[PDB]
RNA sequence: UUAAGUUAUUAAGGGCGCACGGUGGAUGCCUUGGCACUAGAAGCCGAUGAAGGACGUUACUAACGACGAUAUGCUUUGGG
């Protein structure tokens, strides 16, 4: 998910998306550990999604001040 | 046949010369790194936590670089 859609989302939606993305990342890591993950690029994709979500959240809580 | 006399051949190995190899890294050529300077700029950083480090971050990750739990990177504005 890109920064444009992230900015479309609302703050509560940003937090929920961060939670679900972190849960997905955890599941991906566990599959990788157990040897059940072939599509390894998903880990990096989700990591960058989380980074973008947090970036937009920080932008909002900065511009509020 | 005898006697007297003379002189070879031998190379175990060695010497000189020659040929062919090996080892070794000189020499020639080369440059990625240095050395001395010129002109211009700049001449401080730090409790808003520095210099320098430790430990981590990748699908696989021992090391250097980069980066910092938003980690082998995030947003934005321009270039291409």
Curated annotation (Swiss-Prot):
One Gene Ontology biological process: translation
UniProt keyword terms in alphabetical order: Ribonucleoprotein, Ribosomal protein
Cellular component, GO, one term: cytosolic large ribosomal subunit
Gene3D superfamilies: 1.10.287.310
Signal peptide range in chain numbering: none
Keyword Signal on entry: no
GO MF term (any one): structural constituent of ribosome
Record-linked PANTHER family: 60S RIBOSOMAL PROTEIN L35/50S RIBOSOMAL PROTEIN L29, LARGE RIBOSOMAL SUBUNIT PROTEIN UL29C
UniProt-listed NCBIfam families: L29
Sequence similarity: Belongs to the universal ribosomal protein uL29 family.
Protein name: Large ribosomal subunit protein uL29
Gene source species: Staphylococcus aureus (strain NCTC 8325 / PS 47)
Gene responsible for this protein: rpmC
């Amino acid at each position: 998910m890109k920064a444009k859609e992230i900015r479309d989302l609302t703050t509560s939606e940003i937090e929920e998306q961060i939670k679900s993305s972190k849960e997905e990342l955890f599941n991906l890591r566990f599959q990788l550990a157990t040897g059940q993950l072939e599509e390894t690029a998903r880990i990096r994709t989700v990591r960058k999604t989380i980074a973008r979500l947090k970036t937009v959240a920080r932008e909002r809580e900065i511009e509020q001040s």
